[PDB]
Write a protein that binds this ligand. Structure first.
Ligand SMILES: O=C(O)c1ccccc1NC[C@@H](O)[C@H](O)[C@H](O)COP(=O)(O)O
Ligand SMILES: [Cl-]
Ligand code: NA
Ligand code: NA
Ligand code: NA
Length: 234
């Protein structure tokens, strides 16, 4: 199977942020039109705990035909309830959720494939720590947590290097490899794609566990179009 591409629509104040703003419905519909397998839909306000865009996010999901991965501040019963209640295929439980490790284990049993766990990674003196984007504190060691979630039956991981996210500086192929080598759960890469060559680079890891790649900035920078990226990975 070819690498999956998930175009990213990040919502702030009820508009898609790309610094330019515009309709989030339209952005997602346009990506689906260009032939998106999935949309990665993000409530940035909810991720930073600063606001909420559920009602708008529920609209976006209801209007699309394609698979939607929902993400942003998904951290507890209420936040997980509203996310699943949009009818999205998948929700992305944020790194910040790891503050309550048993909540994570409990919701993994309850929801199974509907749940992915976000791993936002920062190398600190060589060490792979977890530090949620939008979160104020450290969330533990990557490998200790990846192992724990793998034995708890985690169905998929979303792996970000917080230092490459939105930077167009290339992905962290060491991190993508390291994670995937350590688990049979599908891995979705997020952050730092600059080119079609990066996609192709990510695609080489499909075989050891990287099924997909989320792309935001390189699409809005017009570095490549979606059908181009779809071609290159096939
Ligand atoms: O996706 C999330 O859950 C999240 C949470 C807090 C802060 C940022 C977040 N993600 C924004 C995200 O959708 C980025 O656009 C993707 O990681 C794409 O990376 P980019 O291609 O822009 O380098
Ligand atoms: Cl989340
Ligand atoms: Na992540
Ligand atoms: Na970054
Ligand atoms: Na990317």
């Amino acid at each position: 199977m070819p690498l999956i591409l998930l175009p990213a629509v990040d919502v702030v104040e009820g508009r898609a942020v790309r610094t330019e703003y515009g309709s989030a419905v339209d952005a997602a519909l346009g990506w689906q039109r260009d032939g998106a397998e999935w949309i990665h839909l993000v409530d940035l306000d909810a991720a930073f705990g600063r606001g909420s865009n559920h009602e708008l996010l529920a609209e976006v999901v209801g209007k699309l035909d394609v698979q939607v991965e929902l993400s942003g501040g998904i951290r507890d019963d209420e936040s997980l309830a509203a996310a699943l209640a949009t009818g999205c295929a998948r929700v992305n439980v944020g790194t910040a959720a790891l503050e309550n490790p048993q909540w994570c284990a409990r919701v993994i049993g309850e929801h199974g494939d509907q749940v992915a766990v976000g791993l936002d990674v920062q190398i600190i003196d060589g060490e792979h720590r977890l530090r949620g984007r939008g979160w104020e504190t450290d969330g533990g060691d990557l490998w200790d947590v990846l192992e724990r979630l793998d034995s708890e039956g985690c169905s998929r991981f979303v792996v970000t290097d917080i230092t490459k996210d939105g930077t167009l500086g290339g992905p962290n192929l060491d991190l993508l490899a390291g994670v995937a080598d350590r688990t049979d759960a599908p891995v979705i890469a997020s952050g730092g794609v600059s080119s079609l060559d990066d996609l192709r680079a990510i695609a080489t890891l499909t075989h050891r566990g990287v099924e997909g790649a989320i792309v935001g900035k390189a699409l809005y920078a017009r570095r490549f179009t979606l059908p181009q990226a779809l071609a290159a990975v096939r």
